[PDB]
Structure 1
Amino acid sequence: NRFTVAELKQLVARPDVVEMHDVTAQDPKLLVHLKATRNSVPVPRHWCFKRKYLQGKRGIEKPPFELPDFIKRTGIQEMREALQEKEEKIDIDYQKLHDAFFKWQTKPKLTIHGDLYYEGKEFETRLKEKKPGDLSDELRISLGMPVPPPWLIAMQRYGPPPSYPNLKIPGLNSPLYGDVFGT
């Protein structure tokens, strides 16, 4: 009465989204069509868990919260800390707070419509895929080269990398400005 997962994956045009719990549904064809939509979002990962999505962060004691630059550039945090130290007033300004709230307003980092909150969502700070020919600033500092990164001197001798065959890096077969020395 219930089809197997291989028969459901062979019949579906997009078999990279089928799960093991979708065979126990009442209509796998409609679920497979709805799961393969263009702008659809998946369900949360707490459907099979037993921690109720809030009991996993028991021993994690990180920073409770961080204030923005528009609030830190007003001097209210230091005055509040001085008042808390005196209790355990300021009257700095009235137009500077309005200027920090209107003119010096910083747009926060929002998220995508499909960017749902994961369980941990703090130890997986993934970011695109900084590949061959493109590096971050600081690691430039450790490397200490003034404005090729010097092991692309040895990418001369030993050859183009097996891992990224399509590679071009400056000065060799790739005829470079700022950070990015290969594409």
Structure 2
Amino acid sequence: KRRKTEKPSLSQLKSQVPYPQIIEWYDCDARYPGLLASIKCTKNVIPVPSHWQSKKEYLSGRSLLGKRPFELPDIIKKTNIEQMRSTLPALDLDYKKLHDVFFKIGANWKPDHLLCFGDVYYENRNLFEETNWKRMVDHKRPGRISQELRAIMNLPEGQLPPWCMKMKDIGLPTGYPDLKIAGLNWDITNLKGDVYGKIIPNHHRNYFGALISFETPEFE
């Protein structure tokens, strides 16, 4: 009773904290709030996954209904057993082939997503969309437009995007000062296919561990 009503306000607790935004309303009933704020707000600690205080047993997810059953890592998919055995609604293969897939072909191979120091998987999360996202931030760059989005845009080949004219009056993108586009800052004769422009960088090892040779263990 008295101890329950003795609690300091969470904002009174914020001042003790160097990173006050992590502390939350429920920290008021922390039996040792001044300590718990220091631990929770300590540098490298990773806050408890928030699926607690929910009674849903951490997975009720509607998204769980729409998750793909599985996908082979493409290196293993090269092994062709996908066609040999149909998992969807004998199969002998070469020892050298399989062994080389894991070792010769797949030594340097690593899953593309993984996760980071403090990455924690909440129920509603799905990594796959973020994998295509990270891969997409990689492939796609300004000045280039795929033929699909080009067809939807109804832009014929050899013709500049509609924002090149408004970009002539307004100016180059503030975010891309080094961006070049045919007809304006960049040679129109170099206009080719899906690329109407490219960023021209103005910036222009061994890491003590350079192996200088790569030799995998041989099965034979």
Unaligned 5+ residue runs, structure 1? Answer: none
Contact kept? 1:5, 1:23, Cα under 8 Å: yes
SS in 1 for 2:25: coil
Instruction: Look up the match of 1:120.
Output: 124
- What is the RMSD computed on CA atoms of the aligned residues? 4.0
Instruction: Look up the match of 2:50.
Output: 45
* 1:140-182 Cα shifts (integer Å, max 9, x gaps): 2125788x97636524423688xx7x773536xxx99x85479
Matched, 1:151 2:151: no
Contact kept? 2:7, 2:28, Cα under 8 Å: yes
Unaligned 5+ residue runs, structure 2? Answer: 1-5, 187-196, 202-220
Instruction: Look up the match of 2:214.
Output: none
Q: 1:159 to 1:70 in 2, by over 3 A?
A: closer
Instruction: Look up the match of 2:110.
Output: 107
Question: In 2, Cα distance between the equivalents of 1:122 and 1:52?
Answer: 18
Question: In 1, Cα distance between the equivalents of 2:124 and 2:70?
Answer: 16
Contact kept? 2:172, 2:179, Cα under 8 Å: no
After superposition, residues 3-82 of structure 1 pair within 5 angstroms as 3-57=8-62, 60-81=65-86
- With the length of structure 1 as denominator, give the TM-score of the two structures: 0.70
Name the count of aligned residue pairs.
169
Contact kept? 1:149, 1:181, Cα under 8 Å: no
Structure 1 residue 3, shift from structure 2 partner: 0.7
User: What is the percentage of aligned positions where both structures have the same residue?
Assistant: 38
Contact kept? 2:63, 2:124, Cα under 8 Å: no
Moved more, 137-146 or 47-56: 137-146
Contact kept? 1:79, 1:90, Cα under 8 Å: yes
- With the length of structure 2 as denominator, give the TM-score of the two structures: 0.60
Q: Which amino acid aligns with 2:100?
A: D
Question: In 2, Cα distance between the equivalents of 1:60 and 1:179?
Answer: 42
SS in 2 for 1:37: coil
Question: In 2, Cα distance between the equivalents of 1:44 and 1:154?
Answer: 47
After superposition, residues 131-146 of structure 1 pair within 5 angstroms as 136=140, 140-141=145-146, 142-143=149-150
